[PDB]
Design a protein around this ligand. Structure first.
Ligand SMILES: OC[C@H]1O[C@@H](O[C@H]2[C@H](O)[C@@H](O)[C@H](O)O[C@@H]2CO)[C@H](O)[C@@H](O)[C@@H]1O
Ligand SMILES: OC[C@H]1O[C@@H](O)[C@H](O)[C@@H](O)[C@@H]1O
Length: 445
Protein backbone atom coordinates (compact mmCIF):
# COMPACT_ATOMS: atom_id res chain seq x y z
CA UNK A 1 0.00 0.00 0.00
CA UNK A 2 1.87 3.17 -1.20
CA UNK A 3 1.32 6.45 0.62
CA UNK A 4 -1.25 8.09 -1.71
CA UNK A 5 -2.50 11.62 -1.04
CA UNK A 6 -6.16 12.61 -1.59
CA UNK A 7 -7.28 12.49 -5.24
CA UNK A 8 -7.60 16.26 -5.75
CA UNK A 9 -4.48 17.16 -3.71
CA UNK A 10 -2.71 20.28 -5.13
CA UNK A 11 1.00 19.76 -5.81
CA UNK A 12 2.73 22.99 -6.64
CA UNK A 13 5.77 25.16 -6.74
CA UNK A 14 6.01 28.72 -5.47
CA UNK A 15 7.77 31.92 -6.48
CA UNK A 16 7.42 35.69 -5.97
CA UNK A 17 7.55 38.59 -8.46
CA UNK A 18 10.68 40.47 -7.35
CA UNK A 19 12.59 37.24 -6.79
CA UNK A 20 12.13 35.93 -10.40
CA UNK A 21 10.75 38.52 -12.80
CA UNK A 22 13.61 40.98 -13.52
CA UNK A 23 12.77 43.49 -16.23
CA UNK A 24 12.51 46.05 -13.42
CA UNK A 25 11.99 49.04 -15.75
CA UNK A 26 9.96 47.16 -18.40
CA UNK A 27 6.50 48.12 -19.54
CA UNK A 28 5.86 51.00 -17.14
CA UNK A 29 7.04 49.31 -13.87
CA UNK A 30 8.19 51.75 -11.19
CA UNK A 31 10.85 51.03 -8.50
CA UNK A 32 9.74 48.94 -5.51
CA UNK A 33 11.09 49.37 -1.99
CA UNK A 34 13.41 46.42 -2.83
CA UNK A 35 14.88 48.14 -5.87
CA UNK A 36 15.72 50.94 -3.39
CA UNK A 37 16.98 48.69 -0.55
CA UNK A 38 19.34 46.68 -2.75
CA UNK A 39 21.34 49.92 -3.17
CA UNK A 40 22.14 50.06 0.57
CA UNK A 41 25.66 48.82 1.43
CA UNK A 42 25.47 45.70 3.61
CA UNK A 43 21.76 45.02 2.86
CA UNK A 44 22.39 42.12 0.38
CA UNK A 45 25.10 39.68 1.43
CA UNK A 46 26.60 39.29 -2.09
CA UNK A 47 25.93 42.87 -3.26
CA UNK A 48 23.35 41.73 -5.80
CA UNK A 49 19.95 43.08 -6.86
CA UNK A 50 16.83 41.70 -8.46
CA UNK A 51 17.23 43.82 -11.61
CA UNK A 52 17.59 40.73 -13.84
CA UNK A 53 16.81 37.82 -11.48
CA UNK A 54 15.57 34.81 -13.51
CA UNK A 55 14.24 37.10 -16.33
CA UNK A 56 10.89 35.38 -15.88
CA UNK A 57 9.05 38.43 -17.22
CA UNK A 58 10.37 37.37 -20.64
CA UNK A 59 10.91 33.62 -20.05
CA UNK A 60 7.60 32.70 -18.35
CA UNK A 61 6.55 30.36 -21.21
CA UNK A 62 9.74 28.31 -20.79
CA UNK A 63 9.15 28.24 -17.02
CA UNK A 64 5.59 26.98 -17.59
CA UNK A 65 6.98 24.15 -19.77
CA UNK A 66 9.30 23.24 -16.89
CA UNK A 67 6.26 23.15 -14.58
CA UNK A 68 4.68 20.72 -17.06
CA UNK A 69 7.79 18.51 -16.81
CA UNK A 70 7.48 18.65 -13.01
CA UNK A 71 3.82 17.53 -13.20
CA UNK A 72 2.46 20.20 -10.85
CA UNK A 73 -1.24 20.95 -10.97
CA UNK A 74 -0.86 24.30 -9.14
CA UNK A 75 1.49 27.33 -9.25
CA UNK A 76 1.84 29.97 -6.55
CA UNK A 77 3.15 33.32 -7.76
CA UNK A 78 2.88 36.98 -6.69
CA UNK A 79 1.73 40.08 -8.54
CA UNK A 80 3.91 43.13 -8.57
CA UNK A 81 1.99 46.19 -7.37
CA UNK A 82 4.68 48.37 -9.12
CA UNK A 83 3.61 46.85 -12.47
CA UNK A 84 -0.17 47.29 -11.83
CA UNK A 85 -0.23 50.83 -10.25
CA UNK A 86 3.25 52.22 -10.86
CA UNK A 87 2.26 55.51 -9.18
CA UNK A 88 1.04 53.50 -6.15
CA UNK A 89 -2.54 54.54 -6.81
CA UNK A 90 -4.41 56.16 -9.70
CA UNK A 91 -3.76 55.11 -13.29
CA UNK A 92 -3.75 51.35 -14.08
CA UNK A 93 -0.71 50.27 -16.13
CA UNK A 94 -2.43 48.22 -18.87
CA UNK A 95 0.86 46.58 -19.98
CA UNK A 96 1.41 45.38 -16.38
CA UNK A 97 -2.04 43.83 -16.18
CA UNK A 98 -1.42 42.30 -19.60
CA UNK A 99 1.65 40.38 -18.35
CA UNK A 100 -0.40 38.67 -15.59
CA UNK A 101 -3.27 37.97 -18.04
CA UNK A 102 -0.81 36.22 -20.40
CA UNK A 103 0.79 34.36 -17.47
CA UNK A 104 -2.57 33.11 -16.10
CA UNK A 105 -3.95 32.21 -19.55
CA UNK A 106 -0.73 30.20 -20.25
CA UNK A 107 -1.02 28.39 -16.88
CA UNK A 108 -4.68 27.49 -17.38
CA UNK A 109 -4.14 26.12 -20.90
CA UNK A 110 -1.50 23.78 -19.40
CA UNK A 111 -3.97 22.68 -16.71
CA UNK A 112 -2.03 24.46 -13.89
CA UNK A 113 -4.26 26.15 -11.30
CA UNK A 114 -3.09 29.74 -10.46
CA UNK A 115 -2.69 30.67 -6.79
CA UNK A 116 -2.09 34.43 -6.76
CA UNK A 117 -0.39 36.29 -3.89
CA UNK A 118 -1.31 40.01 -3.92
CA UNK A 119 1.52 41.29 -1.71
CA UNK A 120 4.94 39.66 -1.56
CA UNK A 121 6.95 42.58 -0.23
CA UNK A 122 7.38 44.83 -3.32
CA UNK A 123 5.42 47.97 -2.51
CA UNK A 124 6.11 50.78 -5.06
CA UNK A 125 8.68 53.21 -3.63
CA UNK A 126 6.44 56.15 -4.53
CA UNK A 127 3.64 54.58 -2.43
CA UNK A 128 5.93 53.80 0.50
CA UNK A 129 6.99 57.47 0.52
CA UNK A 130 3.28 58.30 1.13
CA UNK A 131 2.20 55.34 3.30
CA UNK A 132 4.82 53.07 4.91
CA UNK A 133 3.33 50.01 6.61
CA UNK A 134 3.44 51.90 9.94
CA UNK A 135 0.96 54.50 8.51
CA UNK A 136 -2.72 53.42 8.67
CA UNK A 137 -3.27 54.98 5.24
CA UNK A 138 -1.40 51.95 3.73
CA UNK A 139 -4.52 49.87 4.29
CA UNK A 140 -6.73 51.75 1.79
CA UNK A 141 -3.82 51.96 -0.66
CA UNK A 142 -3.46 48.18 -0.60
CA UNK A 143 -7.23 47.67 -0.92
CA UNK A 144 -7.32 49.92 -4.04
CA UNK A 145 -4.55 47.83 -5.62
CA UNK A 146 -6.45 44.66 -4.64
CA UNK A 147 -9.61 46.02 -6.21
CA UNK A 148 -7.90 46.84 -9.56
CA UNK A 149 -6.15 43.51 -10.07
CA UNK A 150 -8.94 41.24 -8.75
CA UNK A 151 -11.38 43.01 -11.08
CA UNK A 152 -9.20 42.04 -14.08
CA UNK A 153 -8.16 38.49 -13.14
CA UNK A 154 -10.95 37.03 -11.01
CA UNK A 155 -12.63 35.37 -14.00
CA UNK A 156 -9.54 33.13 -14.19
CA UNK A 157 -8.02 33.17 -10.69
CA UNK A 158 -10.06 31.44 -7.99
CA UNK A 159 -7.38 31.23 -5.24
CA UNK A 160 -6.06 34.52 -3.80
CA UNK A 161 -3.66 35.09 -0.96
CA UNK A 162 -3.70 38.58 0.57
CA UNK A 163 -0.25 39.19 2.09
CA UNK A 164 2.74 36.91 2.25
CA UNK A 165 4.20 36.50 5.79
CA UNK A 166 3.10 39.48 7.99
CA UNK A 167 5.88 38.70 10.46
CA UNK A 168 8.50 39.21 7.75
CA UNK A 169 6.87 42.37 6.37
CA UNK A 170 6.62 43.99 9.80
CA UNK A 171 9.47 42.56 11.89
CA UNK A 172 12.23 42.18 9.27
CA UNK A 173 11.11 45.33 7.39
CA UNK A 174 10.61 47.68 10.35
CA UNK A 175 11.88 45.93 13.51
CA UNK A 176 15.21 44.29 12.50
CA UNK A 177 16.22 46.35 9.51
CA UNK A 178 16.96 43.21 7.46
CA UNK A 179 14.36 43.65 4.68
CA UNK A 180 13.02 46.66 2.81
CA UNK A 181 12.50 49.34 3.84
CA UNK A 182 15.28 48.58 6.35
CA UNK A 183 14.06 50.25 9.51
CA UNK A 184 14.68 49.00 13.07
CA UNK A 185 12.23 50.21 15.69
CA UNK A 186 9.89 48.30 17.97
CA UNK A 187 6.95 50.72 17.61
CA UNK A 188 7.28 50.84 13.81
CA UNK A 189 7.28 47.02 13.65
CA UNK A 190 4.15 46.77 15.85
CA UNK A 191 2.26 49.43 13.86
CA UNK A 192 3.24 47.67 10.61
CA UNK A 193 2.11 44.31 11.96
CA UNK A 194 -1.30 45.73 12.87
CA UNK A 195 -1.76 47.43 9.51
CA UNK A 196 -0.79 44.27 7.64
CA UNK A 197 -3.61 42.49 9.49
CA UNK A 198 -6.09 45.27 8.73
CA UNK A 199 -5.04 45.32 5.03
CA UNK A 200 -5.73 41.57 4.90
CA UNK A 201 -9.11 41.97 6.54
CA UNK A 202 -10.26 44.90 4.36
CA UNK A 203 -9.04 43.16 1.21
CA UNK A 204 -11.07 39.97 1.97
CA UNK A 205 -14.55 41.42 1.03
CA UNK A 206 -13.09 43.17 -2.04
CA UNK A 207 -11.69 39.87 -3.34
CA UNK A 208 -15.10 38.21 -2.61
CA UNK A 209 -17.10 41.00 -4.33
CA UNK A 210 -14.90 40.93 -7.43
CA UNK A 211 -15.09 37.13 -7.67
CA UNK A 212 -17.90 34.55 -7.66
CA UNK A 213 -19.01 31.76 -5.31
CA UNK A 214 -15.94 29.68 -6.26
CA UNK A 215 -13.51 32.40 -5.02
CA UNK A 216 -11.29 31.36 -2.08
CA UNK A 217 -8.94 33.64 -0.17
CA UNK A 218 -6.74 33.66 2.89
CA UNK A 219 -3.48 34.94 4.34
CA UNK A 220 -0.01 33.29 4.33
CA UNK A 221 1.73 32.97 7.70
CA UNK A 222 5.31 31.90 8.27
CA UNK A 223 5.41 29.52 11.23
CA UNK A 224 8.29 27.49 12.67
CA UNK A 225 8.24 24.92 15.43
CA UNK A 226 9.56 26.46 18.64
CA UNK A 227 11.35 24.52 21.32
CA UNK A 228 12.85 25.48 24.73
CA UNK A 229 16.59 24.71 25.02
CA UNK A 230 16.20 23.38 28.60
CA UNK A 231 13.43 23.06 31.15
CA UNK A 232 14.67 25.88 33.38
CA UNK A 233 11.53 28.09 33.86
CA UNK A 234 13.45 31.01 32.29
CA UNK A 235 14.16 29.03 29.08
CA UNK A 236 10.52 27.83 29.00
CA UNK A 237 9.40 31.42 29.38
CA UNK A 238 11.83 32.56 26.65
CA UNK A 239 10.56 29.88 24.24
CA UNK A 240 6.94 30.90 24.99
CA UNK A 241 7.76 34.57 24.34
CA UNK A 242 9.46 33.69 21.04
CA UNK A 243 6.53 31.47 20.02
CA UNK A 244 4.13 34.36 20.77
CA UNK A 245 6.34 36.74 18.72
CA UNK A 246 6.82 34.45 15.70
CA UNK A 247 3.82 32.07 15.59
CA UNK A 248 0.89 33.54 17.62
CA UNK A 249 1.20 37.31 16.95
CA UNK A 250 -0.87 37.12 13.72
CA UNK A 251 -2.78 33.85 14.23
CA UNK A 252 -4.41 35.00 17.52
CA UNK A 253 -5.78 38.23 15.94
CA UNK A 254 -7.00 36.41 12.81
CA UNK A 255 -9.01 33.76 14.71
CA UNK A 256 -9.59 35.11 18.25
CA UNK A 257 -9.59 38.91 17.79
CA UNK A 258 -6.73 39.53 20.26
CA UNK A 259 -2.96 39.74 20.42
CA UNK A 260 -0.94 37.36 22.72
CA UNK A 261 -1.57 39.32 25.87
CA UNK A 262 1.58 38.76 27.92
CA UNK A 263 3.86 39.72 25.01
CA UNK A 264 1.65 42.74 24.22
CA UNK A 265 2.14 43.80 27.86
CA UNK A 266 5.91 43.20 27.69
CA UNK A 267 6.25 45.41 24.60
CA UNK A 268 3.95 48.24 25.78
CA UNK A 269 0.31 47.80 24.76
CA UNK A 270 -0.10 51.42 23.58
CA UNK A 271 2.48 50.87 20.77
CA UNK A 272 -0.09 48.83 18.83
CA UNK A 273 -2.43 51.36 17.09
CA UNK A 274 -5.66 49.41 17.63
CA UNK A 275 -8.82 51.38 16.83
CA UNK A 276 -12.43 50.29 17.65
CA UNK A 277 -13.75 47.84 15.01
CA UNK A 278 -10.23 46.68 14.01
CA UNK A 279 -10.55 43.11 15.35
CA UNK A 280 -13.92 42.72 13.58
CA UNK A 281 -12.12 43.56 10.31
CA UNK A 282 -9.06 41.37 11.06
CA UNK A 283 -11.24 38.35 11.93
CA UNK A 284 -13.14 38.46 8.60
CA UNK A 285 -13.71 34.78 7.69
CA UNK A 286 -11.19 33.16 5.35
CA UNK A 287 -11.48 30.03 3.18
CA UNK A 288 -8.09 28.66 4.11
CA UNK A 289 -4.93 29.32 6.07
CA UNK A 290 -1.67 29.12 4.18
CA UNK A 291 1.54 28.16 5.97
CA UNK A 292 5.21 28.70 5.10
CA UNK A 293 7.29 26.29 7.27
CA UNK A 294 11.08 25.64 7.24
CA UNK A 295 12.58 24.77 10.62
CA UNK A 296 12.61 24.13 14.33
CA UNK A 297 13.88 27.02 16.41
CA UNK A 298 15.36 26.34 19.86
CA UNK A 299 15.35 29.23 22.32
CA UNK A 300 16.98 29.99 25.66
CA UNK A 301 16.89 32.91 28.06
CA UNK A 302 19.62 35.29 27.02
CA UNK A 303 20.27 38.74 25.60
CA UNK A 304 21.33 38.05 21.99
CA UNK A 305 17.97 39.46 20.87
CA UNK A 306 17.56 42.41 23.30
CA UNK A 307 13.91 43.08 22.31
CA UNK A 308 12.76 39.60 23.58
CA UNK A 309 15.67 38.69 25.82
CA UNK A 310 16.29 35.34 24.11
CA UNK A 311 19.24 33.45 22.60
CA UNK A 312 19.10 30.59 20.09
CA UNK A 313 20.60 27.12 20.51
CA UNK A 314 21.33 24.72 17.64
CA UNK A 315 20.58 21.14 18.81
CA UNK A 316 22.82 18.39 17.29
CA UNK A 317 21.16 17.44 13.99
CA UNK A 318 21.02 18.25 10.27
CA UNK A 319 21.18 21.83 9.03
CA UNK A 320 20.73 23.48 5.64
CA UNK A 321 23.17 25.94 4.10
CA UNK A 322 21.03 28.66 5.80
CA UNK A 323 21.88 27.00 9.21
CA UNK A 324 18.17 26.16 9.57
CA UNK A 325 17.48 22.92 11.44
CA UNK A 326 15.88 20.16 9.39
CA UNK A 327 12.95 18.98 11.50
CA UNK A 328 10.01 17.56 9.48
CA UNK A 329 8.13 16.59 12.66
CA UNK A 330 7.74 20.31 13.23
CA UNK A 331 5.53 20.60 10.15
CA UNK A 332 3.17 17.98 11.54
CA UNK A 333 3.26 19.76 14.91
CA UNK A 334 2.40 23.16 13.34
CA UNK A 335 -0.44 21.79 11.21
CA UNK A 336 -1.84 19.90 14.18
CA UNK A 337 -1.67 23.00 16.44
CA UNK A 338 -3.50 25.12 13.84
CA UNK A 339 -6.15 22.44 13.28
CA UNK A 340 -6.84 21.95 17.02
CA UNK A 341 -6.67 25.63 18.05
CA UNK A 342 -8.26 27.48 15.10
CA UNK A 343 -9.97 24.79 12.99
CA UNK A 344 -9.36 26.46 9.59
CA UNK A 345 -11.60 24.68 7.03
CA UNK A 346 -8.57 24.16 4.75
CA UNK A 347 -4.81 24.36 5.14
CA UNK A 348 -2.13 24.73 2.46
CA UNK A 349 1.61 24.51 2.77
CA UNK A 350 2.43 27.43 0.47
CA UNK A 351 6.18 27.28 0.97
CA UNK A 352 8.58 24.61 2.21
CA UNK A 353 12.10 23.85 0.96
CA UNK A 354 15.84 23.94 1.58
CA UNK A 355 18.98 25.69 0.45
CA UNK A 356 22.02 23.47 -0.08
CA UNK A 357 25.27 24.12 -2.01
CA UNK A 358 24.58 23.02 -5.62
CA UNK A 359 27.09 22.42 -8.46
CA UNK A 360 26.59 21.41 -12.09
CA UNK A 361 28.49 18.15 -12.76
CA UNK A 362 30.70 17.55 -15.80
CA UNK A 363 27.66 15.75 -17.31
CA UNK A 364 25.41 18.85 -16.85
CA UNK A 365 23.38 17.47 -13.90
CA UNK A 366 22.73 18.85 -10.44
CA UNK A 367 22.83 16.09 -7.81
CA UNK A 368 21.15 17.41 -4.61
CA UNK A 369 20.44 14.37 -2.34
CA UNK A 370 20.19 16.51 0.82
CA UNK A 371 17.43 18.66 -0.69
CA UNK A 372 15.67 15.51 -1.89
CA UNK A 373 15.87 14.03 1.66
CA UNK A 374 14.54 17.32 3.11
CA UNK A 375 11.51 17.28 0.81
CA UNK A 376 10.80 13.57 1.29
CA UNK A 377 10.78 14.00 5.09
CA UNK A 378 8.41 16.98 4.97
CA UNK A 379 6.07 15.33 2.45
CA UNK A 380 5.86 12.36 4.88
CA UNK A 381 4.93 14.78 7.71
CA UNK A 382 2.24 16.21 5.46
CA UNK A 383 0.91 12.71 4.65
CA UNK A 384 0.73 11.92 8.41
CA UNK A 385 -1.17 15.19 8.99
CA UNK A 386 -3.75 14.21 6.36
CA UNK A 387 -4.14 10.73 7.91
CA UNK A 388 -4.80 12.43 11.29
CA UNK A 389 -7.78 14.28 9.69
CA UNK A 390 -6.08 17.68 9.16
CA UNK A 391 -7.68 19.29 6.06
CA UNK A 392 -4.41 19.87 4.18
CA UNK A 393 -5.39 20.54 0.55
CA UNK A 394 -2.11 21.28 -1.08
CA UNK A 395 1.66 21.65 -0.90
CA UNK A 396 3.88 24.11 -2.75
CA UNK A 397 7.65 23.58 -2.80
CA UNK A 398 9.79 26.67 -2.28
CA UNK A 399 10.97 27.14 -4.99
CA UNK A 400 10.40 26.28 -8.64
CA UNK A 401 13.89 27.57 -9.34
CA UNK A 402 16.90 29.19 -7.76
CA UNK A 403 16.19 32.90 -7.34
CA UNK A 404 17.04 36.16 -5.55
CA UNK A 405 16.84 35.24 -1.85
CA UNK A 406 16.38 38.73 -0.40
CA UNK A 407 19.16 39.69 2.02
CA UNK A 408 21.09 36.52 0.98
CA UNK A 409 21.14 37.61 -2.68
CA UNK A 410 21.77 34.85 -5.23
CA UNK A 411 24.12 32.80 -3.03
CA UNK A 412 21.36 30.67 -1.50
CA UNK A 413 19.63 28.31 -3.91
CA UNK A 414 16.17 26.97 -2.97
CA UNK A 415 15.09 25.65 -6.38
CA UNK A 416 14.29 22.16 -7.49
CA UNK A 417 15.47 23.69 -10.83
CA UNK A 418 18.97 25.17 -11.07
CA UNK A 419 19.55 28.52 -12.76
CA UNK A 420 22.87 29.38 -14.34
CA UNK A 421 22.72 33.14 -13.96
CA UNK A 422 25.37 33.81 -16.65
CA UNK A 423 23.14 32.22 -19.33
CA UNK A 424 19.66 31.93 -17.74
CA UNK A 425 19.86 28.17 -18.42
CA UNK A 426 17.43 26.12 -16.30
CA UNK A 427 18.55 22.58 -15.27
CA UNK A 428 16.05 20.35 -13.39
CA UNK A 429 17.87 19.11 -10.26
CA UNK A 430 17.74 15.54 -9.05
CA UNK A 431 15.23 16.74 -6.43
CA UNK A 432 13.05 18.10 -9.26
CA UNK A 433 13.27 14.80 -11.16
CA UNK A 434 12.14 13.00 -8.00
CA UNK A 435 9.32 15.54 -7.43
CA UNK A 436 8.24 14.94 -11.05
CA UNK A 437 7.44 11.35 -10.00
CA UNK A 438 5.69 12.39 -6.72
CA UNK A 439 3.23 14.73 -8.44
CA UNK A 440 2.37 12.02 -11.04
CA UNK A 441 2.05 9.23 -8.47
CA UNK A 442 0.16 11.65 -6.16
CA UNK A 443 2.35 10.42 -3.32
CA UNK A 444 5.60 8.82 -2.15
CA UNK A 445 6.79 5.44 -3.58
O1 LIG B 1 13.69 32.15 12.43
C1 LIG B 1 14.54 33.20 12.88
C2 LIG B 1 15.22 33.85 11.69
O2 LIG B 1 14.19 34.14 10.72
C3 LIG B 1 14.71 34.59 9.46
O3 LIG B 1 13.65 34.93 8.59
C4 LIG B 1 13.03 33.88 7.77
C5 LIG B 1 12.05 33.09 8.63
O4 LIG B 1 12.68 32.27 9.63
C6 LIG B 1 11.09 32.23 7.78
O5 LIG B 1 10.03 31.72 8.61
C7 LIG B 1 10.49 33.04 6.65
O6 LIG B 1 9.68 32.21 5.92
O7 LIG B 1 11.53 33.64 5.86
C8 LIG B 1 12.30 34.59 6.63
C9 LIG B 1 13.23 35.32 5.65
O8 LIG B 1 14.30 34.47 5.27
C10 LIG B 1 15.58 35.83 9.61
O9 LIG B 1 16.21 36.14 8.38
C11 LIG B 1 16.58 35.71 10.73
O10 LIG B 1 17.11 37.02 10.97
C12 LIG B 1 15.92 35.16 12.01
O11 LIG B 1 16.90 34.93 13.04
O1 LIG C 1 13.38 32.40 2.91
C1 LIG C 1 12.96 31.42 1.94
C2 LIG C 1 11.62 31.79 1.34
O2 LIG C 1 10.68 31.90 2.48
C3 LIG C 1 9.34 32.08 1.98
O3 LIG C 1 8.37 31.88 2.86
C4 LIG C 1 9.27 33.52 1.40
O4 LIG C 1 7.92 33.93 1.16
C5 LIG C 1 10.18 33.53 0.14
O5 LIG C 1 10.06 34.79 -0.54
C6 LIG C 1 11.62 33.15 0.58
O6 LIG C 1 12.54 33.07 -0.52
Amino acid sequence: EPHRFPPDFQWGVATSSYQIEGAVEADGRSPSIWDTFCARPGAIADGSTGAIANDHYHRYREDIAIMKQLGVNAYRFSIAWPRILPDGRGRVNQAGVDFYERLVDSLLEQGIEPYATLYHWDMPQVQHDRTPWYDRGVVDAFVEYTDVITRRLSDRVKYWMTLNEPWVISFLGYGAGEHAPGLRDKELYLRAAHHVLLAHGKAMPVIRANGNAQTKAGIVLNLNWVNAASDSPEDQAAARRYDQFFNRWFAEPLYNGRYPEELLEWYGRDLVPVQPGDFDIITTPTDFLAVNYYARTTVKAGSTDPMLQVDFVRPPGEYTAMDWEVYPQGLYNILNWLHTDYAPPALYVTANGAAYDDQVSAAGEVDDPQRLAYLEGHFEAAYRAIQAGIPLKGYFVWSLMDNFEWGRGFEKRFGIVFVDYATQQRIIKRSGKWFSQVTRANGLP
